[PDB]
Amino acid sequence: QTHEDLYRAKSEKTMHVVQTASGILTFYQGLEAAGSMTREAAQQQALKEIKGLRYSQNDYFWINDLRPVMIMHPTNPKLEGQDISTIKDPDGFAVFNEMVALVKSKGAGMVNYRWPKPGASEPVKKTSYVQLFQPWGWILGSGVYVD
């Protein structure tokens, strides 16, 4: 039983909630591909639904693109529609740029950074799984705060 095994286990949870939530993207992208909704309407519906999802103690999902611009953020909604390339956490970690570089290399993975908790302002350590949804150029993310 390795260190690698312990970390693989804890983060599988995060991976699996993101995979679950990404089925909404899948569903709506299918409606686009079939011609039943426009892309932008499929997008907006998918975001609306993912915005309300929660698990555990108020853990949530966000979506940013590869530019990176924030597409949907349920707890920091004033980031929506903004270029988030210049955001850095207190350790100097370039949160969204790193997420983009990660998914461009591997598709998905784990990243650690500091971020406020919902309705708070103090950046707290967080470990997130991010996953590229390729047809729309969207990164879907969720993570868990160290406490």
Author numbering: 32 to 178
Paste lines from the article.
Chemoreceptor proteins bind ligands (either directly or indirectly) and transmit a signal to downstream chemotaxis machinery in order to control flagellar rotation and bacterial motility. However, a recent bioinformatics study has shown that the most common extracellular sensor domains found in prokaryotes are actually Cache (Calcium channels and chemotaxis receptors) domains. Our results demonstrate that this chemoreceptor, designated PscD, has a single Cache sensor domain that recognises specific C2 and C3 carboxylate ligands. Of the ligands probed, PscD has the highest affinity for glycolate, and this ligand is also the strongest chemoattractant for Psa.
To shed light on the molecular basis for recognition of C2 and C3 carboxylates by PscD, we determined the three-dimensional structure of PscD-SD (residues 31–188) using X-ray crystallography. Our two structures overlay with an RMSD of 0.1 Å over all Cα atoms, indicating that they are effectively identical. The Cache domain of PscD consists of an N-terminal helix-loop-helix, followed by an antiparallel five strand β-sheet, which is surrounded by additional helices on either side. In both structures, there is clear electron density corresponding to a small molecule present in the canonical ligand binding site. Propionate models very well into the electron density of both structures, whereas alternative ligands (e.g. acetate, glycerol) could not be reasonably modelled into the observed density. Propionate was not present in the purification or crystallisation buffers, indicating that it was scavenged from the cells and/or medium and supporting the idea that it is a physiologically relevant ligand for PscD. The carboxyl oxygen atoms of propionate form hydrogen bonds with four residues: Tyr90, His103, Tyr143 and Lys156 and the ligand is sandwiched between two tryptophan residues, Trp92 and Trp145, giving the impression of being ‘flat-packed’ with distances of 3.5 to 4.2 Å. The hydrophobic residue Phe126 faces the methyl group of propionate, forming a back-end wall of the pocket. Overall, the bulky hydrophobic residues that line the binding pocket appear to prevent the binding of larger (C4 and larger) carboxylates.
